[PDB]
Amino acid sequence: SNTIRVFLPNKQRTVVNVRNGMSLHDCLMKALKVRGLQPECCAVFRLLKKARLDWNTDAASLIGEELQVDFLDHLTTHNFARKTFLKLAFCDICQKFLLNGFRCQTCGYKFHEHCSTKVPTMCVDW
Amino acid sequence: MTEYKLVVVGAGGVGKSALTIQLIQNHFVDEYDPTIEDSYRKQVVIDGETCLLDILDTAGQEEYSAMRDQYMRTGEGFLCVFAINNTKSFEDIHQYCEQIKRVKDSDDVPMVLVGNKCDLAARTVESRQAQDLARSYGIPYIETSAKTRQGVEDAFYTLVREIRQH
Ligand SMILES: Nc1nc2c(ncn2[C@@H]2O[C@H](COP(=O)(O)OP(=O)(O)NP(=O)(O)O)[C@@H](O)[C@H]2O)c(=O)[nH]1
Ligand SMILES: [Mg+2]
Ligand SMILES: [Zn+2]
Ligand SMILES: [Zn+2]
């Protein structure tokens, strides 16, 4: 099979299909995008104890291998908390009136409870 | 926050990945790239509490059927998906649930039967037939459509509510 096991950040994993001529940076874009990640914010290894690979590496050069994608040095995960906004605030998703909702103190993202799944997956500023 | 190990099972092409990706990214995947194993972690607020859903998107292809016994002992709740425009997928999900109760060795496993692709008008599986199967297992049933996002959050949130008590 033309498959590669790839371990993604935030304790996630996928199994990508490989086409001859296709790149590694392009083969893992979909899996990284649907998880709120960017490849140029990440460095891809190949497990051996890991060997760093360049993002332009041919995806056929590692068929049957197990890779891992990690963050560079110098954030992730939100810390949601119930907050009732006295200062006039609106949601960050639907931009409508928000008085009783939730907010992550780390990111400052404010939203309604029914507006929870449209919050970006990754969180900045730790 | 509370973590929930959700598992999405079902025959091939019923819309498991399209349902999961719709929940976490609000996109609609209209391409069909078959899944082998996909892991998603997304933080969610259900009924006022912060939930981190560790959703396991499984393979519907019969080549990876041996993986069923593996993830059907790890997961806490199972989203058993079929396509309302595909009668073969409705009976395929019948033995998915029966296999879950057997390897869980329980008659009370958090499950949510989900009929997908309800935006389509060429329906061949009545909801009566689906609620018949859902009531026989004592599990809820929720019609969804990964394209129009109808009932997508309802199906995932219902399974979390089933795990929360149990
Ligand atoms: N109209 C419509 N199409 C849908 C819906 N859900 C999925 N599809 C389509 O059906 C096809 C299969 O979707 P997919 O999510 O890959 O199904 P799957 O169960 O994950 N397949 P597999 O088990 O092989 O991984 C895709 O072309 C997708 O766009 C839906 O609700 N409505
Ligand atoms: Mg899939
Ligand atoms: Zn945040
Ligand atoms: Zn909102």
Numbering used by the authors:
A (entry chain C): 55 to 102, 108 to 133, 136 to 187
B (entry chain A): 1 to 166
Recite the paper's sentences.
We present the 2.8 Å crystal structure of the HRas–CRaf-RBD_CRD complex showing the Ras–Raf interface as a continuous surface on Ras, as seen in the KRas–CRaf-RBD_CRD structure. The Raf-RBD interacts with Ras at switch I and the N-terminal portion of β2 (residues 27–41), as previously described, and the short linker connecting the Raf-RBD and Raf-CRD (residues 133–137) is partially disordered in our structure, with poor electron density for residues 134–136. The Raf-CRD interaction involves hydrogen bonds and hydrophobic contacts with C-terminal residues in Ras α1 (residues L23-N26) and β2, extending to loop 3 in the interswitch region (residues K42-G48), with direct and allosteric connections to α5. This interface includes the helix adjacent to the first Zn2+-binding site and extends toward the C-terminus, where the second Zn2+ ion is coordinated by residues C184 as well as by the interface residue H139, linking the N and C-terminal ends of the Raf-CRD. Given its close contact with the interswitch loop 3 on Ras, the Raf-CRD is allosterically connected to α5 through salt bridges that form between Ras D47 and E49 on loop 3 and R161 and R164 on α5.
Ras interacts with Raf kinase through Raf’s N-terminal Ras-binding (RBD) and cysteine-rich (CRD) domains to drive cell proliferation through the Ras–Raf–MEK–ERK mitogen-activated protein kinase (MAPK) pathway.
